[PDB]
Amino acid sequence: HHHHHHHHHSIRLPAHLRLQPIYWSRDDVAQWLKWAENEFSLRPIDSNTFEMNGKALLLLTKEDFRYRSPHSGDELYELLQHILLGRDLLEAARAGQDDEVRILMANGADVNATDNDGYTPLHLAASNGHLEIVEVLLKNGADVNASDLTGITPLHAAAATGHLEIVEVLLKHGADVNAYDNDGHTPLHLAAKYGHLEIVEVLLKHGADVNAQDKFGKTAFDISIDNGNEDLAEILQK
Ligand SMILES: [Cl-]
Ligand SMILES: [Cl-]
Ligand SMILES: [Cl-]
Ligand SMILES: [Cl-]
Ligand SMILES: [Cl-]
Ligand SMILES: [K+]
Ligand SMILES: [K+]
Ligand SMILES: [K+]
Ligand SMILES: [K+]
Ligand SMILES: [K+]
Ligand SMILES: [N+]
């Protein structure tokens, strides 16, 4: 157990590009070209070769990109596709649209797509209780331990929200039972905070450190007492 990070190789967009491409302004298109040239080590791109907004970019075909940028146009086109499909997959995972998740993966969506808060599809499916999507994403190679910008992993999310079956599946697929977020909380702390006694028991059986202390100086036992949950306090003592 450790402080996890984003999945290495996932596309993480800069601040001006947090919105969906349909909302990109003319300025945002120019910023995207500059960011892409650096992130992907491309030949120099003249910003005046795409004098348009994001809606316009979305109408261009790959051939149009190549005409505008012989050296990098196809890469820019595929980068935009990855951004679009990644968002589609994040949304389908959040919403519990099992078929759409399957279809998007068959069409090349990145299983480790990451939004601007660092959430992956697996994190959104875990938080929202969508067990079948968690299983599909894991079967497609999702990073079980990739954490959001606050250090929260999928296992943290499932433990906090009370989805025991998802907790079990994540553990079976290698989730770090002792992952710590930026406030020093482990999954055990969050299961205790939200009163999920059965999850506490599973985490303990899989090696959770009952004595882990968060940045406020508290263990899971302390959190349970703070909430007046003597049921949970007793499990943690015994
Ligand atoms: Cl160019
Ligand atoms: Cl081609
Ligand atoms: Cl064309
Ligand atoms: Cl994305
Ligand atoms: Cl007590
Ligand atoms: K990286
Ligand atoms: K950002
Ligand atoms: K497109
Ligand atoms: K393509
Ligand atoms: K399983
Ligand atoms: N289990």
UniProtKB/Swiss-Prot annotation:
The record marks 18-19 as: Breakpoint for translocation to form PAX5-ETV6. Ubiquitous. It is found in: Nucleus. The record marks 17-18 as: Breakpoint for translocation to form ETV6-MDS2 in MDS. Residues 10-84 form the PNT domain. It comes from the Eukaryota. It is linked to A chromosomal aberration involving ETV6 is found in a form of chronic myelomonocytic leukemia (CMML). Translocation t(5;12)(q33;p13) with PDGFRB. It is characterized by abnormal clonal myeloid proliferation and by progression to acute myelogenous leukemia (AML). Chromosomal aberrations involving ETV6 are found in acute myeloid leukemia (AML). Translocation t(12;22)(p13;q11) with MN1. Translocation t(4;12)(q12;p13) with CHIC2. Belongs to the ETS family. Transcriptional repressor; binds to the DNA sequence 5'-CCGGAAGT-3'. Plays a role in hematopoiesis and malignant transformation. Can form homodimers or heterodimers with TEL2 or FLI1. Interacts with L3MBTL1 and HDAC9. This is Transcription factor ETV6. It comes from Homo sapiens. The gene is ETV6. The chain holds residues 47 to 121 of 452 of the full protein.
